[PDB]
Design a protein around this ligand. Structure first.
Ligand SMILES: C[S@@+](CC[C@H](N)C(=O)[O-])C[C@H]1O[C@@H](n2cnc3c(N)ncnc32)[C@H](O)[C@@H]1O
Ligand SMILES: [Zn+2]
Ligand SMILES: [Zn+2]
Ligand SMILES: [Zn+2]
Length: 423
């Protein structure tokens, strides 16, 4: 018996609403993707199938583009990779955009695969395209994606009889723009992109009552507030460390809507996240484009070098509640963890704790995972009372945001037991 149902909203299209009263942490829906792929920067770093990182991956012998963690993953992926393999081969070294690889997998799934459980509430055919709101600039970009797809797929798809019936590639890419999910690993690093059409019913709120988390490609949807019968379910489509102006731009450009929620009407938290000298944080915001590019390609030593130049700059510095400074601290912490600089990771991580408390209110998975990382660093440095406090706080958050069905909760229970045994 489902706890959620599709419905027609008054002014934001279709949505999901509660059928029964819901409590924080209640699992509402789980879904494998209709289709998904690894992202450009993680290609060859994480397994194409399970999206777990490894130091040595096995490559597909035919295309040598797909890479895997194990014979099992390579073999189990073969059906969903067989047709794209021919295309990826006849395209080296021109790798397609992620959206193109994703739509290719959509096409092969719809043509050759049984009806997907991911479409139980809403199908790819049903997805919102916002075509009558797209600017001419966006339509031109979509037309180039269509021709890129036609080029990439030419060996497996030659005509419309190889596409689903009444399948329009322009409309399909318009759907991908506003319904793609970025897949994050347990450490909240971006590793893939997928379509989850039933989950695509969720409309956006800058102060949402639900949250999603990923366990590999698997998606869990949970309540994070009390929800009444008939109340619409919402998730935040956006990173929380964004001003109302930045949210406005992305919600317009990618999702074609204007938000008039309370936070956007009052510029909630904007002033606090832009504290410090403007000339300084404009420069950090610029540097973060390069830092985040390097992080997306797992270039940890280069990330840390750039972050240290900011955090320990000889010139003027920013408060840790400035969102660009905060993102630099978080990148430096993650770089230090992956480089084994655990004392330095803890220094940066602990500085993010109070800003994360302010900017991730309630139960948010990103805060839960950050707190867990800090507790884990304190546990391995022997700071047991501090570690236990943070590990318990991470559990208080992640019991709501992640739940028993997420494997990270089992990892956290083991840390809590080890730290409790030390105490
Ligand atoms: C992932 S889909 C959500 C389901 C969609 N309403 C539908 O009918 O299929 C995202 C699209 O929903 C609409 N949308 C989502 N959240 C909204 C909101 N808070 N206000 C107005 N429109 C919203 C926009 O059209 C957006 O591009
Ligand atoms: Zn794998
Ligand atoms: Zn292959
Ligand atoms: Zn808003």
């Amino acid at each position: 018996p489902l706890k959620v149902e599709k419905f027609a909203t008054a002014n934001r299209g279709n949505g999901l609403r509660a059928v029964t009263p819901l409590r924080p942490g209640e699992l509402l829906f789980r879904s494998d993707p209709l289709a998904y792929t690894v992202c450009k920067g993680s290609r060859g770093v994480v397994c194409d199938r399970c999206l777990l990182g490894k130091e040595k991956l096995m490559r597909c012998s035919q295309c040598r583009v797909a890479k895997y963690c194990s014979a099992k993953c390579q073999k189990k992926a073969w059906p969903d990779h067989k047709r794209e393999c021919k295309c990826l081969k006849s395209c080296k070294p021109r790798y397609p955009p992620d959206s193109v690889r994703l739509l290719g997998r959509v096409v092969f799934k719809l043509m050759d695969g049984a009806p997907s459980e991911s479409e139980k509430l809403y199908s790819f055919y049903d997805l919102e395209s916002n075509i009558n709101k797209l600017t001419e600039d966006r339509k031109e970009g979509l037309r180039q994606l269509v021709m890129t797809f036609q080029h990439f797929m030419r060996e497996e798809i030659q005509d419309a009889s190889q596409l689903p019936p009444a399948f329009d590639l322009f409309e399909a890419f318009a759907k991908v723009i506003c319904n793609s999910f970025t897949i994050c690993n347990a450490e909240m690093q971006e590793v893939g992109v997928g379509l989850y059409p039933s989950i695509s019913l969720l409309n956006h709120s800058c102060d949402p009552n639900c949250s999603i988390v990923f366990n590999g490609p698997h998606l869990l949807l949970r309540a994070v507030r009390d929800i009444e019968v008939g109340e619409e379910l919402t998730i935040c489509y956006l990173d929380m460390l964004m001003t109302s102006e930045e949210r406005r731009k992305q919600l317009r450009d990618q999702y074609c809507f204007e938000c008039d929620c309370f936070r956007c009407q009052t510029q909630d938290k904007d002033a606090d996240m832009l504290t410090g000298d403007e000339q300084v944080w404009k420069e950090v915001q610029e540097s973060l484009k390069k830092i985040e590019e390097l992080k997306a390609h797992w270039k940890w030593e280069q990330v840390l070098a750039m972050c240290q130049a900011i955090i320990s700059s000889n010139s003027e510095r920013l408060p840790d509640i400035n969102i660009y400074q905060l993102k630099v601290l978080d990148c430096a912490m993650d770089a230090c963890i992956n480089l084994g600089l655990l004392e330095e990771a803890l220094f940066y991580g602990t500085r993010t704790m109070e800003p994360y408390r302010i900017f991730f209110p309630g139960s948010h998975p990103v805060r839960g995972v950050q707190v867990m990382k800090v507790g884990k660093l304190q546990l391995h440095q022997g700071m047991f009372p501090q570690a236990m406090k943070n590990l318990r706080l991470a559990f208080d958050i992640m019991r709501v945001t992640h739940g028993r069905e997420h494997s990270l909760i089992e990892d956290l229970i083991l840390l809590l037991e080890e730290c409790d045994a030390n105490i």
